[PDB]
From a paper:
Apolipoprotein L1 (ApoL1) is a circulating innate immunity protein protecting against trypanosome infection. Here we present X-ray and NMR structures of the N-terminal domain (NTD) of ApoL1 and of its closest relative ApoL2.
No electron density was observed for the four N-terminal residues D61–S64 or the C-terminal segment K142–T172. The resolved portion of ApoL1-NTD spanning residues S65–L141 is composed of four α-helices connected by three short turns of 1–4 amino acids. They form a loosely packed bundle in which the individual helices diverge from each other, rather than being aligned in a parallel lengthwise orientation as found in the classical four-helix bundle. Only a few residues engage in Fab6D12 interactions and are located on helices 3 and 4 and the loop connecting them: A99, V98, R105 (hydrophobic), and L103 and N106 (H-bonds) (electron density in Supplementary Fig. 2a). The most important interaction is made by the positively charged R105, which inserts into a deep acidic pocket formed by CDR-H3 and CDR-L1 loops. An ApoL1-NTD mutant in which the R105 was changed to an alanine residue showed a strong binding loss in a biolayer interferometry experiment, confirming a key role of R105 in Fab6D12 binding.
Numbering used by the authors:
A (entry chain M): 65 to 142
B (entry chain A): 1 to 137, 141 to 222
C (entry chain B): 1 to 213
Amino acid sequence: SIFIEDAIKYFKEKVSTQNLLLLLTDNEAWNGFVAAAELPRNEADELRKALDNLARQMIMKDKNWHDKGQQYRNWFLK
Amino acid sequence: EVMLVESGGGLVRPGGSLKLSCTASGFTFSRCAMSWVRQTPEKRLEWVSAISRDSTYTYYSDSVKGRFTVSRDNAKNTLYLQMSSLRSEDTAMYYCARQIDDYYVDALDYWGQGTSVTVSSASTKGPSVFPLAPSSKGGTAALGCLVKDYFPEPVTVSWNSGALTSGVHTFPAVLQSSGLYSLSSVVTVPSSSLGTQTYICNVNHKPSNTKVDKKVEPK
Amino acid sequence: DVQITQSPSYLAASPGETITINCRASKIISKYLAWYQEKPGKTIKLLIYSGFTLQSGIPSRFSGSGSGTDFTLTISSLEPEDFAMYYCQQHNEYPLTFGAGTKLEIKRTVAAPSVFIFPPSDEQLKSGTASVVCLLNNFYPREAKVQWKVDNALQSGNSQESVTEQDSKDSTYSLSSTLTLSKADYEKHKVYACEVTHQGLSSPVTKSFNRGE
């Protein structure tokens, strides 16, 4: 959990939401990443799971950004 | 069917070097990560090394780090293990093994039969064979042969040129402090057959190209 | 390194029965524990990987369970071919580490050994060495005590033991104990004896000879 909390911060600032998605999406890219990091498999599983939520949380911001922006427009039309 | 065949094993002196090779068949070798595992004379399994499918990453155990080098030639479907500064503790059966492809480190789904490596100062030497005479004391008597002071392993023992197989026990060899091996081969026969039936143990030691026949009779 | 404690070391069972083998990792490794079978003359075989997933072609007699650091291999409805050596192994991280193994042997009735003593040959004595051999033939279980005595003096540190694997037919063991002495030391004494203690014997059996007779 310590390693997970630390990892969450790292992927929030240094890694962009766009970059985070390419990693999480492609199995080939994830394998190369966990191998370079020399992660035990259990930690790799924990990391992907924790990162899935972070991505979803950032996509919720973008989906809300698209929705708020439409309502932002629709209000000015009246 | 997946097939792994090790070679390059054999006799080496302390401080010496050996290069093992493992030819892979029945699958696309370039697609799979490989491991080297060894089993000591104490029958303890010990992982030694590993290499990724494209040699991007190599891995070693602490007991072996800095002395062994794993490599591979995907074109020739061959895995290698260059062993240097060999110690007596490196004496073992060496297996190569294919890893499952779920994670960069994974279980080993296929193994080779293995190649034997013996690290010793001893020179190749054929055995001395001595009789284990049947006791002078309508039942069953025991007799055999003592196969002493040979190197390296194995010795094959037969009785009456293979005609006698029932009741035979050829024991595993023990390594003496002299650095030479020794074992016994015994057989239980009817007491009535003593004096009538001749009993000969045939000892073969391929490493020295030696063959010994020894007749065993009551003293 | 992940240290793995495999238990029990030995198991005696009969065909048709069920047994279990346990393995505990020194740290949490999720499910990534593998089980291997070793038989003589055969390559080592993967039975189960990732704790509970059977490898293709492995019989349904085998199954894997676990909790936390602990893992369990089940073999039910045992067949004769299932009696072999078993090893566990974590594949969560490098270095791969193995349990010390479990030997699954065939259970049978207690059988006492037939004991024989062999003096050294004259041919060997000419080389300056004396080997005295004591044979324990066809006994079960494997646990046995061999005690060398030279003129009633208990010998120590000058013998080596060797034991066969279970006999394919009667599932017994055989054992050889070899006492090594110099020609000089050998000729200092008269009575050479080896005392055998085993479950199948009411009291220890001693086989002996007198040097020169």
